Write a protein that binds this ligand. Sequence first.
Ligand SMILES: N[C@@H](Cc1c[nH]c2ccccc12)C(=O)O
Ligand SMILES: N[C@@H](Cc1c[nH]c2ccccc12)C(=O)O
Ligand SMILES: [Mg+2]
Ligand SMILES: [Mg+2]
Lengths: 673, 661
Amino acid sequence: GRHMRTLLIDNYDSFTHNLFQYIGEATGQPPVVVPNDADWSRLPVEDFDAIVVSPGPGSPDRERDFGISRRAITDSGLPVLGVCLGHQGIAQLFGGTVGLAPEPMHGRVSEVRHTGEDVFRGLPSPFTAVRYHSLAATDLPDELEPLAWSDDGVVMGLRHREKPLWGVQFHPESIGSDFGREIMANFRDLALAHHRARSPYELHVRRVDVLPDAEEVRRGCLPGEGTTFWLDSSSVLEGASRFSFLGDDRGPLAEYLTYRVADGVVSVRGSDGTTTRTRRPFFNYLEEQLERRRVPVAPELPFEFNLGYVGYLGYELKAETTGDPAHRSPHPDAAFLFADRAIALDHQEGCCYLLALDRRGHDDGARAWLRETAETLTGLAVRAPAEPTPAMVFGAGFGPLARARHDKDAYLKRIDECLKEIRNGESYEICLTNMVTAPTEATALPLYSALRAISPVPYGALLEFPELSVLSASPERFLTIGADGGVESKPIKGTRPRGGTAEEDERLRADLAGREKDRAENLMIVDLVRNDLNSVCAIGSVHVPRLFEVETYAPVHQLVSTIRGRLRPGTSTAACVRAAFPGGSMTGAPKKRTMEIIDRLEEGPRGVYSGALGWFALSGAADLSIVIRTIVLADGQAEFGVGGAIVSLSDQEEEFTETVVKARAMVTALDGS
Amino acid sequence: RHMRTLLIDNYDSFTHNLFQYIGEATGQPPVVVPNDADWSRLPVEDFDAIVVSPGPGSPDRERDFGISRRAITDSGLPVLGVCLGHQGIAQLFGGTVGLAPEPMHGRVSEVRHTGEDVFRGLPSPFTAVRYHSLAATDLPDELEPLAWSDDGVVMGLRHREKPLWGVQFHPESIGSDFGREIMANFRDLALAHHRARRSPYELHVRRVDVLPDAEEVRRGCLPGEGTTFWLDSSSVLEGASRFSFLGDDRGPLAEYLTYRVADGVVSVRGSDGTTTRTRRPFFNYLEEQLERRRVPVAPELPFEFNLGYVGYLGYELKAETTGDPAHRSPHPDAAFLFADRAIALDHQEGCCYLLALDRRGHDDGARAWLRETAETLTGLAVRAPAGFGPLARARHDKDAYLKRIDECLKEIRNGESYEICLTNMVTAPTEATALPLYSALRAISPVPYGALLEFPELSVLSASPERFLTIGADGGVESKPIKGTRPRGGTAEEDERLRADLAGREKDRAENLMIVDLVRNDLNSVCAIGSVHVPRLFEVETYAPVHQLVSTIRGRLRPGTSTAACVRAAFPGGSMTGAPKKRTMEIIDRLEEGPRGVYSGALGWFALSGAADLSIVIRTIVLADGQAEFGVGGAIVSLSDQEEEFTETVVKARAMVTALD
Ligand SMILES: N[C@@H](Cc1c[nH]c2ccccc12)C(=O)O
Ligand SMILES: N[C@@H](Cc1c[nH]c2ccccc12)C(=O)O
Ligand SMILES: [Mg+2]
Ligand SMILES: [Mg+2]
């Protein structure tokens, strides 16, 4: 998109250029330094996204000393960080008491304890910071809340309750201080969010203080006949998962859209009956709709899904990112429901939220669907009998009449082809996959009922669509994008089966976290995902809070790493996904050439498998999972992909077995016709 | 301006990771360009550096490498090959790209290195991630390996002549350490290279493997009557002070040069006799002359001073920096001898270097002078091998000075200043001439930055320990602000007490700290983003009169920033003013009630190569009209005791007060 402009007002002080350095290093762009006696009229504040008001002698109660800093705070309407004289400036300009502190403190350290909010995010409490002031903010007004204090018992941080203003008495940039660059990066982040915060719909919200069983909500509130979505936290775990979302295509503002890579056409079905056909690329279409149909996030909600698109992005959409249209999927290459009406379960607090759109102007009785569905939900609330889920094992095949595309022998060959390509330095890691087909007369909901019981996960889902049903028991987070523009990705790479005992379970759990091979498989994907995000994130923002964590589910142990970043200004949430699609964890590195190797060897499409599935909110947030451990149901057969990382140290036979281990949950669900 | 880096993408999934690290390290994001661009249409001459990204395949195939190839061979720019780039530099210069003993993909290695170029400041070992089956085996003589892996593979190389660097690891990888450091080193190596490319003179040089007594050289070779210079390392500690420099104005091409702030007039007097008075701001003029009189650094010299201007910068020149023209100096505000001929002592290796300038396509007896002068030495080398005083009148007496300190404390309480370097100025009638008194002074106080300027309007007799600015030709800057003083102890046990005391005192550390920040600020206005840093902090150095708390700061000049501009942006030294400098200097103006002149200025040399070495002017005696003027002072802060800070100034004068008696 672009980088962010930062203005740095100099109050003819002898520290301004230190702030210049720290802003430069933290944000990856140098600030524009202007003197405080500069002409505001002439100054093009239009072309700036943040201001920093430098330290300086004297007080802000003066035209000299402070000057044009005053305008930045009152008028500009922009994110501002006051430092020392600026911090003091914020106080008096909103009616604050800037008086003599107990002890003047020049070129001297204080321990600073703080909330950890805004400009103090990430910082430990306390930390060390150099002070340069006799004056100090004392009695704060009602508009300003303090964030940090000195050991001296003095205000070291503050902000405005409404406006995007921030202050520090201490000097981040001073050589005696710690976490200067962090603070400057925090302020960058705040400004990015602020700017991202700047509707043809009217969103009605309704809370119900009952929590039925999610399966009871699916069966009770939604129909078997019709297009339905169920985003299912079959596993609920504080921090990891909390919510479930359900809806259908019966509303008056709902739509259903497919895409074909081969045609290159967006087919969409209005609530009218109308069936439009554009010749677009899907990510382009999606970006536009999301921009046009924007809606702000409702504050009462504990989540940022305020309706929008729910569905899946197929692997073959790589054709319109960085890949080639090599193979043509049987199923849609994209497929979503525009959800105008949705039921949202909060497993943590034990309540429901109903959400429905009206057009800004006209009614469309969406408030009717609130009060009706509320009374339905109350009638479905009963004691769910606690039923612990058993872990699974290894010891074989892909099911009785299940035909793998590549049989074992064929796969062991393609593993060897992968191994050749790595020697010749064409890829470092190849995520080669198979595709198993198997007949089943089973309908989606009974079969999903079985799957979710076998393998409860944070990112399960049942999509019942006209062309196909997608029965996902995915544990994998692809992209979680805040409306504020924060991004998280948690690539899974590093698989291990569950232990037959509880001991051997810890043994495999520990082996997976310790092995060089698996850590390497994981690391290479971390770097690849950091790359994808760095393409559309702000410089400094991309980082890795956690590396080589082991998560455990009924079917398997997984090695997971967490990557985070913050979107650049102008970068839409859909741009961010296009940048990262397909996910590194399903392709390998380097992506482009790896995906070419995949095209030759797999000799056919992955379809929905390998893609992403989840939601894009009108708030601009998204939550997407990697499609793995997923059964695609269509035309009387069940299709499911399984894969694995092929690396220098891979063993043909062991890798083949890994694909089977992964098929277990799907294979067990299908068992019993 | 800021340095512009080109990153050549080789369709690899780590290019935007390099983008990130360059952005954070250099403070400026690279312009990314795919490997299949067009060399001509591409304006390579706009950029200052190239980072060649990794990739799949080989540097051989065009598929994989493309325009990167031409970046190394043709561009003539600084280049950093990362992985495939590193593999390309090996091969392009006739080296071998062969199979490594084990393919290493996303796997760490302990890298051990020499600490050179892209590895500067990094520990050995450090951890780095690898992504390659192939590795450099046979390096040409053109190429030189800098780093090695724990399995004995080449991890880093350079070209000996051209400014190429390769690393066979991924600094940008999450599993690697010191990635950002490496990208900064490359930025620094790129800045340096361009400053080496930026003539009216020929430079002749002659070494002589004998070392006479520094003082005797001054007596013998230089005259007592002329206008000479003597940059004197009266203290010679290894890696801290090594050289001494002497000359005179008995050259064809030599010039004396003076400036007055009042007039705004540069006054140059050639050896012809006739002067040439120009109305121009000094630093501008000095910058301009050093541009036109550029002379490449001689490589057989261990020092960078390849002749140039030797002299001082008076305090009052602040009027052209960030200060006001409040007071006229009795003395010239700048006084520089353009040295076309110089003797240079190397105290470490025990030899002399003679330097002399002939005009290009002319002969002015340089080589004739080198033999004459070098011969003279050899003979002398065997003969001689290696309170304020009685009639002294301070500007402010004690009572007055105490009341001026009070004013400082009041301005500090108001918050007009965080620290004020208040100074007094003692004058005293004396009988002695220049060389006899300096002889006493240098013996009393051996220091690294001693100096004896013997100019017409004044003699300067410095016993400065302090460094102000040491700028390289490569554009690297150092500054060691002294702030925090202590007397010596009577015995050896007393010295330890005081050494420890000075180190630990919160008051002193704060005094020093505020200057560190101030100097960082000044350097940052002229230096590359990320380049400014503080290797040492609150180091204590011991000299015959005092123990001094010293902190070291470094940086890199931006492209198109003259060494003169750097001196301008740092002048006067925060050491001698306090922060914030502008406001503090106005306070100083009001209270001191007169000029510092030479005192608290800078003294040293500006080389034709673009180097410089400037001391702060303290522990110094000016001579003019049979009168010895010396300045003393110290930092005033909120914690300052009036009576104590006065005593500090008397202690600081002991060397000067001793030398006169
Ligand atoms: N687990 C998510 C919601 C969710 C469940 N299944 C999903 C599938 C795709 C996307 C999101 C989801 C939460 O707790 O917030
Ligand atoms: N000690 C310096 C030279 C030097 C001695 N006295 C000086 C006075 C001013 C400037 C430089 C000097 C060196 O080692 O190179
Ligand atoms: Mg620090
Ligand atoms: Mg594997």
